Ligand binder design. Structure first.
Ligand SMILES: CC(CO)(CO)NC(=O)Nc1ccccc1
Ligand code: NI
Length: 341
C-alpha cells in the first residue's frame, strides 16, 4: 500500500512509488532520480506512463529495460502539461538526472517535491522565485544540527592534492575509488584529470556512465583497466582484503594502493576538519573516508526552507520513528518562529 507522503492530492500523480503494485487512482508515476530505494519495483514489464528527466529516462531504457513507449522525458526549467496539470522539473543538485518537481494544482495550490536534494543558494533564483509554494515535500535525510560537512569543492581539493602528492612521490602507486550507485562522479573524474589518466572500470559501470550526458565522457573513462591508473570498484571491495586481492590482479605494475570511500556524513565530522583527515593504513594500502555529500547539511536545509516559507512541510526521509518525526517538527517550528512566517 502506497504511503500518503508519496501521493500528490488533487491529481492522479505519485512520486517514487513503484513498489506497491497498481496504485488505485494513479494516472502518471513520477521518478525523481535513478537510485534504487526510489525506482524499486520498476522493470521491463511496467506498463504505465513514467515522467522523469532525460538522463533518468536513458537509465530506465538501458539499465532496467523499460519499454520506450512508457518513458516520458521532460526538459528542465520548462512549463509542461501532464494529464491537464502544469508541472516544472528543476535540478536537485543530487546525482545526475535528479530533479525537484513543482505541481500547479487546478484549485490554485502550489506544491514542491524536492526528491533527494542538496539545497543551494542558486535555487533562490530558479523559477521558484516567481511564486508562492503552499506545501513542501522535503528531503530531511540530515535534519539535525550535528550534521555538518564541508562544501563539495573543499572535499574535491583535498582528494586532488592527496592523490597528486602520493603518485608524484611513487609513480608505481594505483588509485582506487569505490562506487555503488550513480552520483559523486566528480571524485574519480577530478583525480584522473590531475593524474592524466582515464578512469578504468567494469563494462556494467561504463554502460551506466554512458547514459549520463557528461560532456567529453569518451575522453575520461575506459574498460581497458591496463591503460588506467585510476580504477573504480564496488564500495564493498574497498577494504584491506579486497584491495590486496585487486593489487594481485594488476600483474606487478603497482606496489601501493591509495583508495577513497566517499561516504555521506560520519561521526568523524564532529571532531576533525577536512584538512586534518587521515587514512587507515595496513602496509602498502591506505584508505581515506571523505565526506562528499549529495544531501543538504542541516544549515543548507534551514536556509532553503526559511527562504521558501512553505505553509506546510511533509518529510519524506526518517519518517519511520516517532522520535525522528517529533525532532523534525520541532526544528520546523523553530525555523518558522525565527524567520516570522
Ligand atoms: C502538519 C505537519 C505535521 O505537524 C505535516 O507534516 N507539519 C507541518 O506542516 N508543520 C510545519 C511546521 C512549521 C512550519 C511549517 C510547517
Ligand atoms: Ni538518492
Amino acid at each position: 500500500t502506497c504511503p500518503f507522503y508519496k501521493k500528490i492530492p488533487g491529481t492522479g500523480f505519485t512520486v517514487d512509488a513503484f513498489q506497491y503494485g497498481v496504485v488505485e487512482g494513479c494516472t502518471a508515476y513520477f521518478l525523481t532520480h535513478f537510485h534504487s530505494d526510489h525506482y524499486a519495483g520498476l522493470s521491463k514489464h511496467f506498463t504505465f506512463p513514467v515522467y522523469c528527466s532525460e538522463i533518468t529516462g536513458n537509465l530506465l531504457k538501458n539499465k532496467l529495460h523499460v519499454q520506450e513507449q512508457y518513458i516520458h522525458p521532460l526538459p528542465l526549467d520548462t512549463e509542461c502539461i501532464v494529464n491537464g496539470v502544469k508541472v516544472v522539473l528543476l535540478d536537485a543538485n543530487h546525482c545526475p538526472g535528479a530533479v525537484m518537481i513543482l505541481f500547479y494544482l487546478p484549485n490554485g495550490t502550489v506544491i514542491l517535491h524536492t526528491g533527494d536534494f542538496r539545497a543551494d543558494p542558486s535555487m533562490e533564483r530558479s523559477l521558484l522565485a516567481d511564486q508562492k509554494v503552499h506545501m513542501l515535500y522535503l528531503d530531511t535525510t540530515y535534519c539535525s544540527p550535528e550534521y555538518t560537512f564541508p562544501s563539495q569543492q573543499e572535499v574535491i581539493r583535498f582528494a586532488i592534492n592527496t592523490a597528486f602528492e602520493a603518485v608524484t612521490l611513487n609513480p608505481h602507486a594505483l588509485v582506487v575509488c569505490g562506487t555503488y550507485s550513480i552520483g559523486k562522479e566528480k571524485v574519480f573524474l577530478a583525480i584522473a584529470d590531475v593524474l592524466g589518466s582515464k578512469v578504468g572500470m567494469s563494462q556494467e559501470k561504463y554502460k551506466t556512465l554512458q547514459c549520463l550526458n557528461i560532456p567529453e565522457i569518451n575522453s575520461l573513462i575506459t574498460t581497458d583497466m591496463c591503460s588506467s591508473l585510476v580504477h573504480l570498484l564496488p564500495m564493498m571491495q574497498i577494504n584491506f582484503k579486497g584491495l590486496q586481492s585487486h593489487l594481485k590482479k594488476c600483474g606487478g605494475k603497482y606496489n601501493q594502493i591509495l583508495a577513497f570511500r566517499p561516504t555521506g556524513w560520519t561521526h568523524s565530522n564532529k571532531f576533525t576538519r577536512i584538512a586534518d583527515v587521515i587514512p587507515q593504513t595496513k602496509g602498502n594500502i591506505s584508505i581515506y573516508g571523505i565526506p562528499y555529500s549529495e544531501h543538504s547539511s542541516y544549515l543548507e536545509m534551514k536556509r532553503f526552507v526559511q527562504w521558501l516559507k512553505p505553509q506546510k512541510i511533509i518529510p519524506t526521509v526518517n519518517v519511520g520513528t516517532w522520535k525522528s518525526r517529533s525532532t523534525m517538527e520541532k526544528y520546523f517550528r523553530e525555523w518558522k518562529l525565527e524567520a516570522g512566517y
